[PDB]
Design a protein around this ligand. Structure first.
Ligand SMILES: [Cl-]
Length: 156
């Protein structure tokens, strides 16, 4: 219900990308319970566990809160097409479920959400979807290259 959803607005860099897809930064432990209460079914974590900011065992927190957990860590300095494909496969395996894809500050996740919507034929607006990037995509040519390569691969 709407109250549980407005109840997600304290999650860092949270942005609803579609009625069944949320993207965000890193939920704290209590926020995973809020996610469950809002109806989220699956959490897809793109943040490497090696980050000093990461939970020691995010999957424990996610599964304890009653949700399914997928871990696809994405290296900031060398994001791979294979990472994007792995995300796309995870989305297909959770067809019809409410999903959160996240990282620390929603850069990786909003980029991956854009590519997903683009390949699904949903014609996303890039700037809108990637609001957390605060127009910094040009700063990061490896990310630019990833986005261009995947867009071209899947018809766009
Ligand atoms: Cl915490």
């Amino acid at each position: 219900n709407i109250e549980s959803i407005e109840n997600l607005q304290g999650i860092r860099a949270l942005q609803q990308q579609a009625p069944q897809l949320l993207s965000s930064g890193l939920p704290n432990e209590q926020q995973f319970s809020l996610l469950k209460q809002a109806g989220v079914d699956v959490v897809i974590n793109l943040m490497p566990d090696s980050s000093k900011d990461a939970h020691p065992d995010e999957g424990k927190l996610v599964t304890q809160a009653g949700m399914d957990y997928v871990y696809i860590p994405v290296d900031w300095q060398n994001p791979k097409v294979e990472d994007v494909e792995a995300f796309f496969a995870a989305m297909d395996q959770h067809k019809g479920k409410d999903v959160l894809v996240h990282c620390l500050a929603n850069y990786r996740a909003s980029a991956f959400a854009y590519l997903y919507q683009l390949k699904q034929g949903q014609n996303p607006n890039m700037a809108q979807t990637m609001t957390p990037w605060n127009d910094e995509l040009a700063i990061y040519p490896k990310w630019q290259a990833l986005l261009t390569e995947v867009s071209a691969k899947y018809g766009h």
